[PDB]
Design a protein around this ligand. Structure first.
Ligand SMILES: [Cl-]
Length: 309
């Protein structure tokens, strides 16, 4: 169990797209951001690694290692300070992603927490929930996939703390994404991403499915809300990796060629809930999928449950 990095309260990320559709990357700005947020990505990668190792069984020390990192960042007020604004809201986006990563790890390992670990971490996760939510109170921040990624951390905090208020808030974030799906299956704000339109339909589906999957831990079936709307979106993503013809036309740009990876692992869960599971076999074959921002190994979590028991 390596030493827990410093949990600085401040974040100074750097946005790195060159165009209005945020679809072409400035490599020098990308490298600068990668270095600037390195501690935040490192924190996410490790707590998820420890949670995965805990889930393997016969390794409670790993689960305890995750809790020590979480407790350390909680006690230092990590990410609750200044969200430095350079050329966009990338610092707030990092806090959204890192809150989700931290909350998923706590949700998976909290059985091993001590009482002060429980109180320190849960108070911190709720403070992050409140801060990330306040960001979206500004109507100028359009509620695209970043809004649904915010819901990952809200929902994981809601379930881990059994907080009915936060549960209702997270349900509203999820349902806001379901409501945004058009009859043809598109998400307009993600279709505006030109060559990354398919990638961002995939990237928007991922937190919606993970939220629904966490709702199952509370016995709830969120796939019945506007039943079939999430299926149309998920099916477009799967069809898009087979043939980008539709995304090309609807987005006005030839899609960037890429295979499913990382957060695409929502399919591991969703293929178990879809009315036509075999439609997702081609995406499933690209597994296994691992993403710290979603709790770690999505392939194993889909098979064994999010919380190891
Ligand atoms: Cl600054």
């Amino acid at each position: 169990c390596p030493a827990p990095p410093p949990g600085s309260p401040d974040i100074r990320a750097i946005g790195y797209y060159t165009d209005a559709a945020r679809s072409v990357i400035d490599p020098r700005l990308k490298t600068q951001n990668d270095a600037a947020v390195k501690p935040l990505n490192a924190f996410a990668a490790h707590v998820a690694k420890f949670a995965d190792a805990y889930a393997k069984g016969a390794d409670e020390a790993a689960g305890r290692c995750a809790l020590t990192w979480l407790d350390a960042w909680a006690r230092s007020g990590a990410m609750l300070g200044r969200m430095a604004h350079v050329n966009n809201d990338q610092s707030d986006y990092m806090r959204q992603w890192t809150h989700g990563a931290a909350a998923m790890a706590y949700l998976r390992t909290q059985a091993l927490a001590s009482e002060q670990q429980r109180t320190d971490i849960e108070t911190w996760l709720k403070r992050l929930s409140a801060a990330n939510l306040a960001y979206w109170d500004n109507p100028k921040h359009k509620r695209n996939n970043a809004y649904y990624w915010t819901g990952v951390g809200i929902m994981a905090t809601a379930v881990a703390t059994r907080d009915d208020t936060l549960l209702n808030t997270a349900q509203g974030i999820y349902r806001a994404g379901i409501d945004a799906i058009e009859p043809d299956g598109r998400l307009p704000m993600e279709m505006a991403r030109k060559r990354l339109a398919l990638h961002y339909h995939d990237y928007a589906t991922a937190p919606l499915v993970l939220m629904a999957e966490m709702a199952r831990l509370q016995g709830e079936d969120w796939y019945t809300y506007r039943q079939g709307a999430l299926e149309r979106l998920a099916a477009r993503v799967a069809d898009g990796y087979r043939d980008p013809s539709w995304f090309n036309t609807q987005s006005g740009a030839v899609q960037e060629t890429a295979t499913p990876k990382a957060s695409s692992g929502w399919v591991e869960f969703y293929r178990l809930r879809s009315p036509d599971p075999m439609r997702f076999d081609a995406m499933h074959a690209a597994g296994p999928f691992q993403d710290p921002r979603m709790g770690g190994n999505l392939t194993l979590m889909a098979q064994e449950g999010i919380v190891p028991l």
